[PDB]
Design an enzyme around this catalytic site. Sequence first.
Site, short mmCIF file in Angstrom:
data_model
loop_
_atom_site.label_atom_id
_atom_site.label_comp_id
_atom_site.label_asym_id
_atom_site.label_seq_id
_atom_site.Cartn_x
_atom_site.Cartn_y
_atom_site.Cartn_z
N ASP A 35 43.12 40.21 44.56
CA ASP A 35 43.94 41.19 43.85
C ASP A 35 43.57 41.17 42.36
OD1 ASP A 35 45.89 42.90 42.82
OD2 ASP A 35 47.57 41.61 43.31
N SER A 199 38.45 56.30 32.27
CA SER A 199 37.57 57.24 32.94
C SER A 199 37.37 58.50 32.10
CB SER A 199 38.15 57.59 34.32
OG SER A 199 37.42 58.64 34.91
#
EC number: 3.4.23.22
Length: 330
Positions: A35, A199
Amino acid sequence: STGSATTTPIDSLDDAYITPVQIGTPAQTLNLDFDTGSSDLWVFSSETTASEVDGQTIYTPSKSTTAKLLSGATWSISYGDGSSSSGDVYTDTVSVGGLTVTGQAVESAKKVSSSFTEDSTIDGLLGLAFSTLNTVSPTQQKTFFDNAKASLDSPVFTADLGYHAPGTYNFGFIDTTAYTGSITYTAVSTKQGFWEWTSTGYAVGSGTFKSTSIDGIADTGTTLLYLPATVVSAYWAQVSGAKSSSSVGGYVFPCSATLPSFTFGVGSARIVIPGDYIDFGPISTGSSSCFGGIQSSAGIGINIFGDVALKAAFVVFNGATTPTLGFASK
Ligand SMILES: NCc1ccc(C(F)(F)F)cc1
């Protein structure tokens, strides 16, 4: 030194991925969910309330010659889906794929939420975010990656998740046969303790690329892709009959529809997520409504590049003193 381990989807929808991890002496092998959105290594154990355990493999510190109780230390964690677990802390030897760390904090769950209990395939979590998020009190503990860093050839690990198929987590080296083209690196912010990056935009199917900054986290522990409402609405508007459903809690679409791909930007590069990766199947057995793999982050407060996005790429988690994230097509 290096380590390399195979990771396997837990079901036919790739809801999560499990990787075998060796804890203790002699080794006890548990299947842990790696994780990158959390920083605690916690396991079902002989200390977990017996009604809260349904088929999981449990860590038994009394049978490990290297286990030492970390006196006074406790941990309590709550995940973004409302899951929770807590208990005490041992240190022990932990090996992933031949890579061994001694004296790793192993957080023994005395209580786990029902979410984990009903998932017999996941014995625990191995957190790979930055150690500032670790929940051990009063002495915060280091992650597996942080403890391994000094002995690794390079301070990196890579996630190569498979679509309905096994993949690989590598520690300490970049497999240059695992991707095509070049790796594009992008800056990471550690200010919230996540692998947080920006992004450069997106495109839906074969539409024009929209340049726009999307801040979000690289999270192997989250199944879906959670993006701002404007982006998610522009994606689902291209699917005939798709709609946001309040009773289901997200966008659903007619199982007969074919889904467009989704492209996200990494600097100047593009990562294409095939439309098939966004299909999460019927909302219930026999239903003709299917659940979408791209959902709105509006309720969450942060954008999450989960498994849906990461399994379309080869991903480098570069834990150098200036951390970066690398993305490559594969
Ligand atoms: N997979 C770990 C995880 C889960 C939830 C969140 C949230 F909701 F806080 F963003 C972060 C990290």
